[PDB]
Structures are given as C-alpha cells and as structure tokens.
Amino acid sequence: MLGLKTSIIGRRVIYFQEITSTNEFAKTSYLEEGTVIVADKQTMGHGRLNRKWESPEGGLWLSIVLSPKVPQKDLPKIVFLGAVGVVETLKEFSIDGRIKWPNAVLVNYKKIAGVLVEGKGDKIVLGIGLNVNNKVPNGATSMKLELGSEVPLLSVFRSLITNLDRLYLNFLKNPMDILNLVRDNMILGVRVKILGDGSFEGIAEDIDDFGRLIIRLDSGEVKKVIYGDVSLRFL
C-alpha cells in the first residue's frame, strides 16, 4: 500500500512499532537484497563500538540489506552512500547537512544523523539513524529543530529511500562516483583530532580512492585514516 517506486531498496519493507536494533535484526534474519528494516523506536540502538544510539519515537531508524557484487575494496564506500543519501534528503527539506568523516551528517556542526555499516557473511547491512521529530541528546539536532515544525516522518522515509536506491544502482555500475559526491559534501580544509591510541591532529585534506581520510600533520607527514573518531571542535 506504500506504492514505492524504487528498483531495489524498498522492494520490501519490514516495519516494527518497537525493536532492539534494526541492524541486529537485519544481520540475523534471512532477507532478500533491498529489504528495509524500519522501526518507530529502538531499545538497543547502537553506533560504532559499544556506543548507544538514542532512538526514541519521532526519528527515522532503519537498515537496508545489500549484496554488492563488486570488488572487496569498494565495500568501505557503502557508509558514504548512506551519508550522501541523507544529505540529499535534507536538501530537499531545505536543510544543509555536511558530512563528517566517516559516517556522520552535521548541520551547523550539530549531529543530525549517523550511519553504521556491518557485513555479516556476504550480506551487507546499511544502518541509518536520522533525527526528525524526536528528542535528541545535547549537542545534537533534528529536522524539526532546524525547520521549527513537525516534519512528516513518512515523507522523509520516501525521500531517503528514493535517493538511496538511485545512489546504490549507480554505485553498482560506477563505484567511484560516490567519492566525489562525498568530497563536495564533506567538511574539509580544517584542523581535526583523530582519537584513540596514537591520537594526533592535522588538516583534513580529502579522502582518497579507498575513502581513507587524508590528514596532513604539522610536520608535513601524511597519514591515511581507515577508521576512528574525528573531532572538529575539540577546544
């Protein structure tokens, strides 16, 4: 009854009033490619590592099952499809989101969305969390806060799914295309701090062909980040 017009992403949608985690459900259940798992609320939503992702009613919490028959080296770009998709959807609602490497979307430096990609077996799970009308943690933001009014959650869903389907189908054909859309919508040319053991700072110059964040340290040394947390305003 939704009448979705997408080719793959959205072929099937499994909606839950409540769930532990759409990503977890997607990983442990046999689902065909393109199936979307979405829930009004998540009780065990999660980000990277052991981080909880607040998922109260009002937001858009979903996961998409993908089976990318592309080289293994390109698989790390799936996160970007999710981030760009969000950026495009926000633009449709007159919101300017900017990507924060490697999986976040910010509006005036406030996190409005996060992406989490996991690969159980040869099946890839693209998880996306976007704040729409829900309450958010301090420092974060939502579409409702940015627009000052309730936004039809289903409208955001249709919009995001439409963008993701187009981005995914193109990615399967022209896998390097997503990098340039990321570069044009990512926060660059600024000093950032890369946390974790062996923490360092430098200018986030760009992302390379593997999607690695290229950092120029003050010494001139160039480092390529594959994973980790980026901090824009750390002081």
Ligand X SMILES: Nc1ncnc2c1ncn2[C@@H]1O[C@H](COP(=O)(O)OC(=O)CCCC[C@@H]2SC[C@@H]3NC(=O)N[C@@H]32)[C@@H](O)[C@H]1O
Which residues lie near a second copy (CB under 8 A)?
1-6, 10-18, 38, 40, 57, 60, 62, 153-154, 156-157
Neighbours of 231 (CB within 10 A): 14
Indicate which of ligand X, a second copy, none lies near residue 40 (CB less than 5 to 8 Å, by partner kind). a second copy
Q: Concatenated DSSP letters for 44-82? A: S-B-STT-B----TTSEEEEEEE---S-TTTGGGHHHHH
Look at residue 57 and give the partner it binds from a second copy, ligand X, none, a contact being a CB closer than 5 to 8 Å depending on partner kind. a second copy
Dist. CA 12–CA 222, nearest whole Å: 44
| Cross-strand partners of 128 | 62, 115
Q: How far is the CB of 91 from a second copy (least distance, A)?
A: 20
Site for ligand X in 191-220 (CB under 6 A): none
Q: Between 163 and 185, name the residue whose CB sits nearer to a second copy.
A: 163
135-140's contacts with Cβ under 8 Å and 24+ in sequence apart are 135/56, 135/58, 136/54, 137/54, 139/110, 139/111, 140/110, 140/111, 140/112
Going by C-beta distance under 8 Å and a sequence separation of 6 or more, which residues neighbour residue 2?
13
Question: Which one of a second copy, ligand X, none interacts with residue 66, CB within 5 to 8 A by kind?
Answer: none
For position 54 contacting ligand X by CB under 6 A, the verdict is: yes
Question: Residue type at 166?
Answer: R
Instruction: Decide whether 222 or 232 has the Cβ nearer to ligand X.
Output: 232
**Which is nearer to ligand X, 116 or 167 (by Cβ)?**
116
Q: Determine the 3-state secondary structure of 83 from DSSP.
A: helix
Residue 140's identity, in one-letter code, is A
Longest pairwise C-alpha distance within the chain: 59
Task: Say which entry of a second copy, ligand X, none residue 228 contacts (CB below 5 to 8 A, set by partner kind).
Answer: none
Query: Which partner, ligand X, a second copy, none, binds residue 51 by CB below 5 to 8 Å per kind?
Result: ligand X
**Which residue number, 154 or 217, has a Cβ lying nearer to ligand X?**
154
Residue 14 contacts which entry, ligand X, a second copy, none (Cβ below 5-8 A, type-dependent): a second copy
- Interface residues with ligand X (CB under 6 A)? 21-23, 42, 45-48, 51, 53-55, 61-63, 103-104, 111, 114-116, 127-129, 131, 136-137, 140
